Amino acid sequence: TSNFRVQPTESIVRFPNITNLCPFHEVFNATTFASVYAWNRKRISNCVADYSVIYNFAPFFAFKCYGVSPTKLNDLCFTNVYADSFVIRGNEVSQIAPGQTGNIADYNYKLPDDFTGCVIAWNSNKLDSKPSGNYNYLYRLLRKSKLKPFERDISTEIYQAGNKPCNGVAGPNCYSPLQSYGFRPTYGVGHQPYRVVVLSFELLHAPATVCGPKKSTNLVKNKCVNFNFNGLTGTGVLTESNKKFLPFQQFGRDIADTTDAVRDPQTLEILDITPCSFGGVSVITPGTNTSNQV
Amino acid sequence: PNMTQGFWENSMLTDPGNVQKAVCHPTAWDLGKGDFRILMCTKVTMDDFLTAHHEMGHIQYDMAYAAQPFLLRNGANEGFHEAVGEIMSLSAATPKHLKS
Amino acid sequence: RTQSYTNSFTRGVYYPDKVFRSSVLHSTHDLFLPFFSNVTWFHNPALPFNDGVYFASTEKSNIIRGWIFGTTLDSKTQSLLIVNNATNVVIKVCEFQFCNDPFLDVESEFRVYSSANNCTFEYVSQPFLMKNLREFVFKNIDGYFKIYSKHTPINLERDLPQGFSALEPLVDLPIGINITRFQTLLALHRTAGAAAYYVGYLQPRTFLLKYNENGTITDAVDCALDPLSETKCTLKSFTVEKGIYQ
Ligand SMILES: *[C@@H]1O[C@H](CO)[C@@H](O)[C@H](O)[C@H]1NC(C)=O
Ligand SMILES: *[C@@H]1O[C@H](CO)[C@@H](O)[C@H](O)[C@H]1NC(C)=O
Ligand SMILES: *[C@@H]1O[C@H](CO)[C@@H](O)[C@H](O)[C@H]1NC(C)=O
Ligand SMILES: *[C@@H]1O[C@H](CO)[C@@H](O)[C@H](O)[C@H]1NC(C)=O
Ligand SMILES: *[C@@H]1O[C@H](CO)[C@@H](O)[C@H](O)[C@H]1NC(C)=O
Ligand SMILES: *[C@@H]1O[C@H](CO)[C@@H](O)[C@H](O)[C@H]1NC(C)=O
Ligand SMILES: *[C@@H]1O[C@H](CO)[C@@H](O)[C@H](O)[C@H]1NC(C)=O
Ligand SMILES: [Zn+2]
């Protein structure tokens, strides 16, 4: 008549542990973000990117994601991640965005037209402001031409707005391009120093090696369960196995090219897989003329 | 708009008294770069209330023209600034406002 | 330096995929070094990488130290360096401008490379190298650079011993750079020195691999080598009975 099959009760996922974590506590909490004219270009790769710590850091004045969805930040994987750290004023935060033009945007740092990532900003009046004044931070307000996206300029040539060569000295129509922010505790919001770290995500023709951390569920044994072991998916009953694997081997297959054993990613243990019970169902019946019992 | 948290923190609206020595002429200060303060030894009187209105009118003017360049960061002529103060002072003392 | 030649015998077989098979004859199509193929013995500055390479070193002093891989071997194109010192193995994927003749002083690596303008990747691991024959297989497939290796005790003999030593995968790296030529770096003391290494080139082949009870490749058959091997591959059995087989 039909087939009888035991449905899985629970779903189990086992992935290798996340002992590798991206250096988010290095791009943030660096205690010195240099200046916007010379922005720190840090490469983040070959690590699991967990945004839980990023949320667990200080409340963000501006956390806007353009290319990568805030929900899918962990889901999406990228080959390389670039974080740019710099200190800018409150009103200069808006200029760091796609399609926005301003002094900082054109002469210091330009987000590309098709930028993918999230702009992270938070207030830094406590650390970056001193009563004497934080003259260390600088920005550029004079330059010959607009900067192309993702460019760094650190060379100070006396701006020749006039018709006569400056000869490398300051004077009439000869101004040093660099100008200093001054940060004091009494400054109002909008001129207070703001710390911005721009997360840039790029896809390259290579393995991503940067996938958000993936959760692990407790192992269920001797029960019909759905299982996803390090990318190997199936339905079955997981039992203890006498078989001994080699260190590099992770799966086991039989003569029929079907999976029969799997090595548990977290604790190295060989678990044999038995297909969940299935079988035909037959109805033994005397003639319905005689009786209806079966 | 309404006053800044920095304004509330830095401004001295009450007479310190005792050891502290200060001038008690009311003044609204636009120190620059987003700092606004009132230097006023304010007591609980109707004249002090109206003077507070006048000074906060000054600060609202200063906040409004903050965006413009430094040289132009002033009233259009010498009269408009105290005029903007005085209109608020006049409106504050109206019996309708007092009853409200 | 000295292009002599030798017979490879049944050497260079490795585990194709990370699966466990017990008492199974499995047929796999992959890049393998063909059996009884001539292998160059060194005792063109950059040896062509081709699809893959098989490198063998038998010196007791372990004087060989690392390898170099690149497309054009200049600052223009990305390159790969593997340096194995006594403590740990260092793999650096950087656009390396190398010396025309790379070698190391080993307490210094200055003699090796001229410049490293940008570094794409880095890795540090336990040292690879440990009457001992060290065999390595290098191949870059679908963007992953794979290194298989084996360390076999060999009795004193003139050539590669006749036996099966399956090479166990050591390192898989997601470097993703094109590799056209390679070179072997040698440790010289600033003293004359001599080292001998075997180079063979892998080819697309079909192999029949025997896995014993404990999942080790005990034996292998190269299908295209000889008619009997083709018969064994067709029947999928090492033992072939009397008869005529298409
Ligand atoms: C997961 O954590 C345990 C310790 O709790 C550790 O023994 C195990 O090796 C970790 N997983 C991996 C894949 O390293
Ligand atoms: C006053 O200013 C704060 C911001 O400082 C704002 O949140 C609030 O809505 C404003 N108005 C009132 C009625 O508090
Ligand atoms: C005034 O400033 C001096 C420093 O010049 C400081 O010691 C003092 O505490 C301040 N206040 C008063 C009431 O003197
Ligand atoms: C202004 O609006 C408030 C809203 O609660 C009201 O209480 C007050 O009476 C109004 N004032 C006048 C003068 O209409
Ligand atoms: C081996 O190389 C590593 C590279 O980081 C270095 O730290 C270590 O000191 C070296 N050891 C010796 C013995 O040369
Ligand atoms: C990274 O390497 C590439 C190689 O083509 C080079 O063009 C680029 O300038 C390097 N990055 C930096 C920041 O120098
Ligand atoms: C597998 O078992 C046999 C004995 O049955 C033993 O000789 C062999 O060494 C085992 N495999 C390995 C890799 O040790
Ligand atoms: Zn006034």
Q: Are A246 and C20 in contact (CB under 8 A)?
A: yes
CB atoms within 10 A of CB A80: 19
Among B42, B27, B33, B45, smallest CA distance to B4 is for B33
Q: Which two tokens stand for residue B63?
A: 């906040």
Among A135, A131, A127, A150, smallest CA distance to A32 is for A127
What are the Cα distances from residue B91, in Å, to A55, A290, B56, B87?
48, 105, 13, 6
Q: Are C171 and C195 in contact (CB under 8 A)?
A: no
Mutate to test the interface with B, among A91, A186, A191, A192 (most CBs of B within 10 A): A186
CB atoms within 10 A of CB A138: 19
Among A11, A8, A18, A46, smallest CA distance to A213 is for A18
Technique behind this structure? cryo-EM
CA distance linking residue B91 with residue A221, whole number of Å: 80
Q: Are A110 and A148 in contact (CB under 8 A)?
A: yes
B54 is in an annotated binding site: yes
Return the ligand number nearest the Cα of C65: 5
CA distance linking residue C137 with residue C149, whole number of Å: 6
Q: In sequence order, what are the residues at sequence separation of 6 or more whose Cβ sits closer than 8 angstroms to the Cβ of residue C45?
A: C100, C183
Hey, is C206 helix, strand or coil?
A: strand
CA distance linking residue A17 with residue A265, whole number of Å: 8
Hey, is C177 helix, strand or coil?
A: coil
Contact between C20 and A205 using a beta-carbon 8 Å cutoff: no
Q: Long-range pairs for B62-68 at CB < 8 Å and ≥24 separation?
A: B62/B28, B62/B30, B62/B36, B63/B1, B63/B36, B66/B30, B66/B34
Q: What's the order of all strands across the beta sheet hosting A117-123?
A: A40-44, A80-88, A194-202, A117-123, A62-65
B81 is in an annotated binding site: no
Q: Which chains touch B (3 or more CB pairs under 8 A)?
A: A
Is B55 part of the annotated catalytic residue set? yes
Eight-class DSSP state of C180: -
CA distance linking residue A215 with residue A17, whole number of Å: 9
Q: Which residues line ligand 1 (CB under 6 A)?
A: A 16-17, 19, 265-266
The widest CA-to-CA distance across chain C, in whole angstroms, is 65
Q: Which chains touch A (3 or more CB pairs under 8 A)?
A: B, C
CA distance linking residue A78 with residue A75, whole number of Å: 10
DSSP string, C5-53: EEE--S---B--SSEE-SSEEEEEEEEE--TT-EEEEE---SEE--SEE
Q: Does the CB atom of residue C214 touch ligand 7 within 6 A?
A: yes
CA distance linking residue A102 with residue A84, whole number of Å: 18
Contact between A189 and B33 using a beta-carbon 8 Å cutoff: no
Q: Are C166 and C34 in contact (CB under 8 A)?
A: no
CA distance linking residue A285 with residue A149, whole number of Å: 80
CA angle C169, C170, C176 (to 5 degrees): 95
Chain A residues within 8 Å of chain C (Cβ atoms)? 45-46, 204-207, 209, 243-246, 248-255, 261
Q: Dump strand ranges (E) for A37-177.
A: 40-44, 62-65, 80-88, 117-123, 138-140, 159-160, 174-175
